[PDB]
Scaffold this active site. Structure first.
Site, mmCIF file in Angstrom:
data_model
loop_
_atom_site.group_PDB
_atom_site.id
_atom_site.type_symbol
_atom_site.label_atom_id
_atom_site.label_comp_id
_atom_site.label_asym_id
_atom_site.label_seq_id
_atom_site.Cartn_x
_atom_site.Cartn_y
_atom_site.Cartn_z
ATOM 1 N N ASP B 50 0.764 -1.248 0.000
ATOM 2 C CA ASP B 50 0.000 0.000 0.000
ATOM 3 C C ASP B 50 0.805 1.316 0.000
ATOM 4 O O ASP B 50 0.541 2.213 -0.807
ATOM 5 C CB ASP B 50 -0.972 0.011 1.183
ATOM 6 N N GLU B 157 -9.585 -2.541 3.163
ATOM 7 C CA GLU B 157 -9.438 -2.314 4.605
ATOM 8 C C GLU B 157 -10.523 -1.414 5.191
ATOM 9 O O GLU B 157 -10.708 -1.357 6.410
ATOM 10 C CB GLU B 157 -8.061 -1.782 4.959
#
Ligand SMILES: Nc1ncnc2c1ncn2[C@@H]1O[C@H](COP(=O)(O)OP(=O)(O)OC[C@@H]2O[C@@H]([n+]3cccc(C(=O)O)c3)[C@H](O)[C@H]2O)[C@@H](O)[C@H]1O
Ligand SMILES: Nc1ncnc2c1ncn2[C@@H]1O[C@H](COP(=O)(O)OP(=O)(O)OC[C@H]2O[C@@H]([n+]3cccc(C(=O)O)c3)[C@H](O)[C@H]2O)[C@@H](O)[C@H]1O
Lengths: 245, 245
Positions: B50, B157
């Site tokens: 990420d 997420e």
């Protein structure tokens, strides 16, 4: 009318019945806490009008739930960095009173910043580090105790973006939303608060929020500061949002 | 369908064009900057997928702004608490590469905690202080240098609320919004990233978000976690909000 839209968006009323505002707001806290199953609330008490109003409302909300047979508690914390706060505590009368001194966390961070970087944190930047350290303290207490963090944000504070993003802005719920500074003084009087606690211009800002006729000087300045601070009133921006355009 | 509903509120596409995705995200970053008149970005780099994608995208945006005659820069910060982060920096090739060790700030907080309350912070709660401490670190740097803080949140997420509220969830803009985990991996492969940098499960979470058919057990677990974490994807709650009732 930009004044009408802002007034609408921030939930400000032109006139209020203070007794009914106290009732409506205590009921919001009770209601939110029963919905989520949390054990109560935690709030930083500074001596200032806002946290005084917000703390008394939370003690009243917690007491009503226990009266209905439930379990709720309110923790008021003083957050110094090394008199009115004490006067505020005698008035609010929280179930528990805590204190967490933020001076050593803030110092450790300052020294590291200079050491790693080669620069001193400027007053203004260390000012925000304190607001954010107090957030962490409130979330550490809530985390350890199973409580929700109250925010003292209200309308006059919302139009101007007058708070640290993720500092005093970082909270779970906000009982003073829609209220102006002057309306917030009214509630306190109703609650029987000592005068020392509730005593462009802020009163000018309250006039605009309440839909009163103001000067274009003031109107224009306010409408620009607002669009300028929208980012503090929303969740982080993505390409899928439009308010920032 | 809740699968459909969540997929839409989270902006996920069942099918993507990798090169177009890159250009869209670089363009969002460039466009936000221009509207606000920001000088650039700052982001903590950790060695994982990420931060590596968000960081390579920030660098391309910043290099593209300058080639048009603009002013922009990106600072990548290592945020250790006491090999891959280095490999990552080697791939991102950011304008500036800094570092801030958060161990002393955290130990200062935990020490005062025990000193004040009598009890010690649980490992889990200490871990949320560390995440919140990395946000203060990044925000101090963006304040000192006049940069906007980037966030790494993406659809994989957000559904699970798998982030710290006001910790890594505290950012200014989010260039990875709506991408699933494998979709992000696909963008890193287009960009030519070293394979070690990217090499309920995530596959099931991704299948659900991409609108693929999955077993009832997956949908039940995700939809429940999603409901209980809505507060992390919304602005602090007030009595005028219906999402929580
Ligand atoms: N347009 C944009 N879009 C997305 N993000 C943007 C942005 N513009 C700035 N930012 C970001 O927001 C920042 C600035 O906001 P922030 O860090 O909050 O900082 P700042 O605006 O500097 O204000 C912090 C403070 O608010 C006041 N304050 C603080 C605490 C309490 C109270 C009170 O009255 O109770 C008042 C005060 O004047 C001051 O000390 C940035 O450095 C940045 O990373
Ligand atoms: N319903 C509600 N309405 C309004 N507010 C509510 C609330 N429910 C909880 N809250 C609050 O939010 C809280 C819980 O949020 P938060 O403080 O974020 O904490 P929590 O969800 O426990 O987050 C810790 C973590 O986030 C994740 N995370 C963080 C950083 C890195 C990674 C990793 O594994 O690498 C993962 C992950 O699940 C985990 O380790 C509470 O203490 C409370 O103050």
């Amino acid at each position: 009318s930009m004044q009408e839209k802002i007034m609408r968006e921030l939930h400000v009323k032109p006139s209020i019945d203070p007794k009914q505002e106290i009732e409506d707001r205590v009921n919001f806290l009770k209601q939110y806490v029963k919905k989520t199953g949390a054990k109560g609330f935690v709030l930083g008490i500074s001596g200032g009008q806002d946290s005084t109003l917000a703390g008394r409302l939370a003690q009243l909300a917690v007491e009503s739930i226990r009266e209905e047979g439930g379990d709720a508690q309110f923790i008021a914390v003083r957050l110094p960095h090394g008199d009115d706060a004490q006067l505020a505590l005698k008035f609010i009368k929280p179930d528990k009173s805590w204190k967490f001194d933020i001076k050593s966390t803030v110092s450790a961070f300052s020294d590291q910043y200079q050491q790693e970087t080669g620069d001193q944190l400027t007053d203004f930047n260390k000012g925000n580090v304190k607001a954010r350290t107090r957030m962490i303290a409130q979330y550490a207490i809530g985390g350890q105790e199973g409580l929700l963090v109250l925010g003292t944000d209200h309308a006059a504070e919302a139009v101007t973006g007058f708070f640290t993003k993720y500092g005093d802005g970082g909270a779970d719920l906000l009982p003073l939303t829609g209220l102006t500074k002057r309306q917030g003084r009214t509630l306190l009087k109703e609650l029987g608060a000592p005068e020392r606690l509730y005593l462009i211009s802020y009163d000018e800002i309250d006039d605009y929020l309440e839909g009163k006729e103001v000067s274009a000087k003031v109107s224009e300045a306010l409408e620009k500061r607002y669009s300028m601070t929208e980012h503090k009133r929303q969740v982080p921006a993505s390409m899928f949002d439009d308010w920032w355009k």
